[PDB]
Design a protein around this ligand. Structure first.
Ligand SMILES: CCCCCCCCCCCCCCCCCC(=O)OC[C@H](COP(=O)([O-])OCC(O)COP(=O)([O-])OC[C@@H](COC(=O)CCCCCCCCCCCCCCCCC)OC(=O)CCCCCCCCCCCCCCCCC)OC(=O)CCCCCCCCCCCCCCCCC
Ligand SMILES: CCCCCCCCCCCCCCCCCC(=O)OC[C@H](COP(=O)([O-])OCC[N+](C)(C)C)OC(=O)CCCCCCCCCCCCCCCCC
Ligand SMILES: CCCCCCCCCCC[C@H](O)CC(=O)SCCNC(=O)CCNC(=O)[C@H](O)C(C)(C)COP(=O)(O)O
Ligand code: SF4
Ligand code: SF4
Ligand code: SF4
Ligand code: SF4
Ligand code: FES
Ligand SMILES: [K+]
Ligand SMILES: [Zn+2]
Lengths: 263, 209, 162, 115, 176, 96, 129, 54, 94, 115
């Protein structure tokens, strides 16, 4: 076929036409940091963390949605790219509340891991952080909206995968909150995956709330039995008891979604 | 370094050790495989197992090397390799105040010629290594357990050996002397899989495979 | 200030004493070659006259700026080693004097918060300090792959870690 | 030269009263053992390339204290100690002739040590 | 630079040789140690009167653990488990539960001293200064089951030991 | 405040109480199942609720550096009173 | 390959008699290997790059005095690192452990087209970004 | 015998592998206490020697 | 802190002025009621121009450099011979 | 190739010899072992407790493993000559105080989830 030839950090890559920069780098084993974009959902480009310089780039191009053309070299470790990561990330850690000891994502938070890798060691914020009032979308999914990063990951899941269009954003500016504008029951039978979708502690499992921490839990691979699809899952076992049902990774069985009953 | 956080470098030493790295390579092309000096000025010689006693002899004897001090004996075990145990020596040259590292590879069954003749310090370091890892060396004077318990079976430092061990002991009055039994902990070792799921160093990343 | 008046107390008790000396001098000797052939270090070599000390030959930390002497034995026996140990204590006191009068201002840990925990005041106020403190005190700083054999001048010998 | 070295620093070894001659006879013995080695061998060339300066340097300088400073191998006593120590190397290098290519390539995986 | 330690050839002078001979025959350097030891005898002993008298300490001393609480009364611990993750001997075991109100602290907070190392790492690992290394070195006992505390006694220890640490962290909050 | 179990032993703050048929209770014989009298359940409810006039407030927990890390709680829900998870004390709008 | 009185001992390596793990822990232990799956809430697929060796979870009972998870099997927390699966099984054969192998669930190479988020007839157009 | 002489080696092992250096003031504290630590061993390296000696 | 007569006895039996400073401690020590400190900020505490990429020690470490692999010159030494130390100018013979 | 370098036993025959003088040392060791070591077990049960350990390893076909084990056999042997081990150390071979391990399927089912 076409199979346009591209480069990443100098190394040549054989990639298919129409692919994005992030997928092209993923071929060699490059996981560009990302918050808004997910594999199984449509590209949004709101995180702006994926911003990575390419060869001879007057302007940095977002790796989330950037069809890479012929003869393109991705400057993964360029100083401009690293400056891009630091700039947008500190912007993420501007109104985020000091809840790491409290938020259940601590130790398994995507945001936390990026900060040690692609982040500065100190802050410059000297003003008052924003605070978002909490909502309630189910007695199974804790809603703490002050930790939201407005990555619209939950928005796409409700519309595309879940199929119920009730979740979304509201307002504008810094007060661009994510919610429903009205007390609503998030009724999707596979809505439990919204906990895994959210990279932060904005959505937290109410039954699992304040129960365990990532490093002590022992992961064991298994398959659910409540349904006959056999959606394989992972059980989090700490000190000989089960607390959390982690959906597994199997393309032709369950992708990465499981029902709330299974979860 | 105008920045006071990162550690400085000694490029003069780094090249100088690299020059001696290739120096040994021509001297003993049969035994060395590849010689590498790390970024933090540590030049390591990688030699073949069967030629363990000559290279150590050469470094102890040669004027330009004069490495006569067996600093340490280590045999770091990596389960993913065919011959797991890689035996690492450690030498110091007093006259050139520099350190060299010569190392081989050896499975659980292959015996190595003991380097006690070339280094008397290897003697007790030899009694420890066979204890912890289980790699027997040949024609050692008195190769025998000097670390583990008298009759303690199994080399504890092996990867397959659990940290908690296999047996535990306890005094028993019905026999009026201590006695062993299978290990049964009051509290198990709670494993902490804390490794970050995000890449930490782009420089050391392996090529795609 | 008060300590230098105490090694003299030990040395008055022991060094000049014939009873200490007879049990000690020429009791246990090592030659030059078997000293470093057996892997000895520190006082064991220094008592045997071996001209080696890790602080001077391979300085580490700020030991290059300090100025001191290393006692070197002449017989390699027990009396020499004990005498070098006594003199090392006196030379240690001189290092304390230079260290005391040369303490520089500044911080106490590397400003890189990814390797050292941030200050408590910043950890309770700033985001980056808190999130780093959480992950540093739950994962630890990621050390790059490699190997090293840093060895310092231990009071006995060349205590090091591979 | 000068008055005889009463002590040789390092204990156990004995001060030699014939330094220059001992260096001469030892260095010639170094070259003698170097004779029965192919000239293409690195070890022969390397040691010959250092002993030629070493042998001519003692043969030129008649003062042992100056010879200490010139060679910078410390006192003569350890210089002759290593010269005979190197003599064992050259003699017994003949039994591990290294000049031929290596035994075999390493079985791949033992290198590349990030896992 | 180095200093030679042991070589001083004694003079063979008549005065010097009779010095060594007098030193040998008449024990003189031998009585020197004997004589000074007399001088040190008259020194008053440097012994404290335990328990009537106790040795000097410092505010940053590590002793028995004591879980403190806020001035209102709510216990500081918020079950972040950082102390458990850092504890070099895994002396901490933590379980948590959201109970009814703003007081979900621990289902279980067991600190195992006979396993603990007294490194104090839990103290500075705590983001809310909940677990602290108390200033009491004096908590010995006769039974092995005693040397472990439950969550309750940690609270009782923090309740019983409260004035000392409150002032200790008051003086040491800037250093750490 | 501490209650008493039907077997005559005081209940702990977490609600744990040894069953009457339980055998491991005998550890309490000639000893005590001591219970922290200051129940965190009853040690925070009676604290007064503040009436600050602002949308968002930084709660420190008192003492500045000595308190819990500063947390920006929100007061917009009129039915519910705001609170800091670290401390648990209440916050409220000025009656709006 | 190095001829030093070489004999053709090509039988499968059996180091179990030398390592001497107890009989209950050499036969009655189903040793299983896989590649660990990435945590779903994380986006850390790089942790799915290494073959990992595991064991079977045995009894985990509660301590009477406190309530613990006291274990009787020494091989409870033991996990081993392997670059490729053939090395992992090779360790199993020499250590005579009953081995089970899973495969590396490589991701499907999905095609992402942001232009498809705004189409004229295709349903893939997004109602809210 | 030597409390912080040891982790001084261990500390030097890690941050030097980490390509990180300590602040200049910290190194002065390390060497000052390392010398105090050097005094610590030598105190009973000689006296406990004399204890077994008599 | 004793009688003068025994002070002469201790000073003469030991032959040294012990009374100038003694093993035990007295009020010359610093009081344990220190004023609050004002610990300094670090070099990287600059409010601007503090990008991590310019001071990243961990990321600036390269893999171990390789010079020769299995797949007229001059003979060298790992380092120049160690300089012979000079006697202690303060005091060269104990 | 798959060919390997033996240490002492080139094949089964010499390895069979090496296990034989282990018996030669052990058989005359057990009597005075009980005598010197203050043991209360007789020679009769001492002899066959050396026996069954030969069948404890009577399945290995690799000469190296037999050779890797022959060194340990004389190691525990030598450890017993010079009273280095203590009474409990050799008692550990005499499995005496542990509860008997269940064998039939009914027993482990009645004991617990042990497979
Ligand atoms: C030769 C020995 C002669 C008898 C002892 C003399 C002695 O040492 O007196 C202390 C006296 C002072 O000692 P210090 O250590 O300077 O006192 C410092 C403080 O003032 C000391 O402060 P303090 O508060 O200790 O002062 C009170 C102290 C004062 O104690 C004394 O003065 C000791 C004499 C008993 C009173 O008395 C006590 O503490 C009460 C307890 C006494 C215990 C029993 C003593 C029995 C002594 C022998 C009795 C006869 C047999 O010693 C001298 O002055 C030396 C005189 C030597 C004379 C030699 C003649 C031949
Ligand atoms: C309360 C009790 C008070 C009385 C105690 C008496 C005994 C202790 C007296 C003090 C200690 C002796 C002096 C000392 O240590 O140093 C000074 C000095 C130390 O001398 P030195 O070792 O420096 O050598 C002196 C000689 N020149 C100077 C040439 C090197 O003591 C003497 O010289 C005294 C020698 C004593 C000999 C003992 C045996 C003979 C005793 C008499 C016959 C019986
Ligand atoms: C209490 C006293 C102190 C503590 C005392 C107990 C502890 C010390 C025990 C020392 C003995 C050790 O266990 C076993 C050894 O030496 S070697 C086993 C060799 N195994 C094979 O080679 C497999 C095939 N085996 C056979 O074919 C035959 O069974 C055999 C060769 C064994 C004999 O029969 P035949 O000669 O063929
Ligand atoms: S979501 Fe992540 S960064 Fe935010 S509070 Fe929770 S752990 Fe911390
Ligand atoms: S609630 Fe979570 S998933 Fe939804 S936009 Fe905010 S951060 Fe993203
Ligand atoms: S000092 Fe604290 S952190 Fe360290 S082991 Fe003891 S309780 Fe755990
Ligand atoms: S004591 Fe402190 S560190 Fe430990 S769980 Fe409680 S709040 Fe967290
Ligand atoms: S991937 Fe481009 S912003 Fe999330
Ligand atoms: K989430
Ligand atoms: Zn609060």
């Amino acid at each position: 076929s076409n199979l346009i030839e591209v480069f990443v950090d100098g190394q040549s890559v054989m990639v298919e036409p129409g692919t994005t920069v992030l997928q092209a780098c993923e071929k060699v084993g490059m996981q560009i940091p990302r918050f808004c974009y997910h594999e199984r959902l449509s590209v949004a480009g709101n995180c702006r963390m994926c911003l990575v310089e390419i060869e001879k780039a007057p302007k940095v191009v977002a790796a989330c949605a950037m069809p890479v053309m012929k003869g393109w070299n991705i400057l993964t470790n360029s100083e401009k790219s690293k400056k891009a990561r630091e700039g947008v990330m500190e912007f993420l850690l501007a109104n985020h509340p000091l809840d790491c000891p409290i938020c259940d994502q601590g130790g398994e938070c995507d945001l936390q891991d990026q900060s040690m890798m692609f982040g500065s060691d100190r802050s410059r914020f000297l003003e008052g952080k924003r605070a978002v009032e909490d909502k309630n979308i189910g007695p199974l999914v804790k809603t703490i909206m002050t930790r939201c990063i407005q990555c619209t990951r939950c928005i796409r899941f409700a519309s595309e995968i879940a199929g119920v269009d009730d979740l979304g954003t509201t307002g504008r500016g810094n007060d661009m909150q994510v919610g429903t504008y009205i007390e609503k029951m998030f009724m999707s039978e596979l809505s439990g995956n919204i906990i895994d979708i959210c990279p932060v502690g904005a959505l937290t499992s109410k039954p699992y709330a304040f129960t365990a921490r990532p490093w002590e839990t022992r992961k064991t691979e298994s398959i659910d039995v409540m349904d006959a699809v056999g959606s394989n899952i992972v059980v989090s076992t700490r000190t000989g008891e089960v607390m959390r049902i982690l959906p597994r990774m199997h393309e032709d069985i369950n992708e990465e979604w499981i029902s709330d009953k299974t979860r | 370094d105008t920045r006071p956080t990162i550690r400085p470098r000694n490029d003069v030493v780094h090249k100088q050790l690299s020059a001696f790295g290739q120096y040994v390579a021509e001297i003993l092309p049969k035994y060395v495989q590849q010689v590498q000096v790390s970024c933090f000025n540590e030049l390591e010689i990688f030699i073949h197992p069967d030629g363990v006693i000559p290279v150590l002899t050469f470094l102890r004897d040669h004027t330009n090397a004069q490495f006569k001090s067996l600093a340490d004996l280590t045999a770091v075990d990596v389960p993913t390799r065919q011959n797991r145990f890689e035996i690492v020596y450690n030498l110091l040259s007093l006259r050139f105040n520099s350190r060299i590292r010569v190392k081989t590879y050896t499975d659980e069954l292959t015996p190595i010629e003991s380097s006690v003749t070339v280094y008397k310090a290897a003697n007790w370091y030899e009694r420890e290594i066979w204890d912890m890892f289980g790699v027997f060396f040949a024609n050692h004077p008195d190769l025998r357990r000097i670390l583990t318990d008298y009759g303690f079976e199994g080399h504890p430092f092996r990867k397959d050996f659990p940290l908690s061990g296999y047996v535990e002991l306890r005094y028993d009055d019905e026999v009026k002397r201590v006695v062993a039994e299978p290990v049964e902990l009051a509290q198990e070792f709670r494993k902490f899989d804390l490794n970050s799921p995000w890449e930490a160093f782009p420089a050391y990343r392996q090529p795609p495979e | 200030k008060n300590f230098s008046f105490r090694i003299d107390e030990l040395e008055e008790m022991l060094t000049n004493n014939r009873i200490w000396r007879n049990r000690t001098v020429d009791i246990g000797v090592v030659t030059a070659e078997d000293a470093l052939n057996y892997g000895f270090s520190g006082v064991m070599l220094r008592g045997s006259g071996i001209q080696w000390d890790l602080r001077k030959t391979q300085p580490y930390d700020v030991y290059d700026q300090v100025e001191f002497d290393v006692p070197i034995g002449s017989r390699g026996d027990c009396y020499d080693r004990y005498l070098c140990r006594v003199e090392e204590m006196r030379q240690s006191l001189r290092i304390i004097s230079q260290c005391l009068n040369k303490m520089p201002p500044g911080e106490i840990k590397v400003d890189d918060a990814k390797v050292s925990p941030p200050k408590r005041a910043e950890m309770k106020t700033s985001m980056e300090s808190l999130i780093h403190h959480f992950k540093l005190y739950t994962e630890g700083y990621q050390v790059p792959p490699g190997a090293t054999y840093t060895a310092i001048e231990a009071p006995k010998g060349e205590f090091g870690v591979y | 030269a000068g008055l005889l070295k009463k002590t040789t620093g390092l204990v156990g070894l004995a001060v030699c009263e014939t330094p220059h001659e001992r260096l001469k006879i030892l260095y010639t013995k170094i070259l003698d053992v170097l004779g029965q080695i192919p000239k293409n061998a690195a070890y022969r060339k390397y040691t010959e390339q250092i002993t030629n300066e070493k042998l001519g340097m003692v043969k030129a300088e008649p003062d042992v204290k100056k010879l200490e400073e010139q060679l910078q191998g410390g006192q003569i006593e350890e210089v002759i100690l290593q010269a005979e120590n190197e003599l064992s190397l050259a003699r017994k290098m003949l039994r591990w002739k290294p000049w031929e290519p290596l035994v075999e390539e390493p079985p791949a995986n033992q290198w590349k040590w990030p896992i | 630079t180095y200093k030679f330690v042991n070589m001083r050839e004694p003079s063979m002078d008549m005065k010097s040789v009779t010095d060594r001979a007098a030193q040998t025959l008449l024990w003189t350097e031998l009585v020197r140690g004997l004589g000074m030891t007399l001088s040190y005898l008259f020194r008053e002993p440097a012994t404290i009167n335990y328990p009537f008298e106790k040795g000097p300490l410092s505010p940053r001393f590590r002793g028995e653990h004591a879980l403190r609480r806020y001035p209102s009364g709510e216990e500081r611990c918020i079950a972040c488990k950082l102390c458990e993750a850092v504890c070099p001997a895994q002396a901490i075991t933590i379980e948590a539960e959201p109970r009814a109100d703003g007081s979900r602290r621990t289902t279980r907070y067991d600190i195992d001293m006979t396993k603990c190392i007294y490194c104090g790492f839990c103290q500075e690992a705590c983001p809310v200064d909940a677990i602290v290394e108390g200033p009491n070195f004096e908590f010995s006992t006769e039974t092995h089951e005693e040397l472990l505390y439950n969550k309750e006694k940690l609270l009782n220890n923090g309740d019983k030991w409260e004035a000392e640490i409150a002032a200790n962290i008051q003086a040491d909050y800037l250093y750490r | 405040g501490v209650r008493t179990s039907p077997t005559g032993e005081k209940v702990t703050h977490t609600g744990q109480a040894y069953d009457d048929g339980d055998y491991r209770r005998v550890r309490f014989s000639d000893r005590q199942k001591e219970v922290n009298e200051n129940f965190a359940i009853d040690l925070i409810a009676e604290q007064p609720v503040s009436e600050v006039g602002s949308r968002v407030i930084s709660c420190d927990g008192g003492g500045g550096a000595l308190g819990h890390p500063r947390v920006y709680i929100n007061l917009d829900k009129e039915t519910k009173t705001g609170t800091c998870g670290y401390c648990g004390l209440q916050f409220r709008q000025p009656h709006h | 390959t190095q001829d030093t009185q070489l004999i053709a001992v090509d039988e499968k390596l059996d180091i179990t008699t030398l390592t001497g793990v107890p009989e209950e822990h050499i036969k009655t232990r189903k040793v299983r290997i896989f590649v660990p799956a990435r945590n779903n809430m994380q986006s850390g697929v790089n942790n799915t790059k290494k073959w990992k060796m595991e064991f079977d979870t045995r009894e985990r009972w509660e301590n009477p005095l406190m309530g613990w998870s006291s274990t009787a099997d020494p091989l409870s927390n033991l996990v081993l690192t392997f670059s490729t699966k053939e090395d992992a099984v090779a360790f199993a054969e020499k250590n005579g452990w009953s081995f089970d192998v899973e495969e590396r669930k490589v991701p499907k190479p999905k095609s992402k087209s942001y232009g498809a988020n705004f189409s004229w007839n295709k349903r893939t157009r997004v109602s809210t970004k | 015998v030597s409390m912080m002489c040891n982790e001084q080696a261990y500390s030097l092992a890690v941050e030097k592998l980490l390509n990180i250096q300590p602040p200049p003031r910290a190194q002065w504290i390390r060497v000052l206490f390392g010398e105090i630590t050097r005094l610590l061993n030598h105190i009973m390296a000689v006296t406990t020697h004399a204890l077994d000696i008599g | 802190s004793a009688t003068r007569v025994i002070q002469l006895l201790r000073n003469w039996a030991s032959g040294r002025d012990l009374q100038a400073k003694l093993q035990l401690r007295y009020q010359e020590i610093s009081k344990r009621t220190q004023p609050p400190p004002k610990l300094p900020v670090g070099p990287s505490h600059k409010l601007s121009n503090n990008y991590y990429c310019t001071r990243d020690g961990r990321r600036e470490a390269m893999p171990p450099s390789i010079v020769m692999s299995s797949q007229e010159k001059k003979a060298v030494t790992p380092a120049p011979p160690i300089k012979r130390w000079e006697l202690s100018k303060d005091q060269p013979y104990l | 190739g798959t060919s390997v370098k033996p240490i002492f036993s080139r094949d089964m025959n010499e390895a069979k010899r090496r296990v034989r003088e282990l018996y030669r040392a052990w058989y005359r060791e057990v009597p005075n072992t009980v005598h010197l070591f203050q043991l209360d077990i007789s020679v009769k049960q001492g002899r066959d407790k050396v026996r069954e350990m030969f069948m404890k390893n009577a399945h290995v076909t690799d000469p190296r493993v037999v050779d890797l084990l022959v060194i340990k056999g004389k190691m525990e042997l030598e450890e017993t000559i010079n009273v280095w081990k203590q009474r409990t150390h050799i008692m550990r071979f005499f499995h005496e105080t542990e509860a008997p391990r269940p064998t039939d399927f009914l027993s482990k089912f009645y004991v617990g989830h042990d497979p």
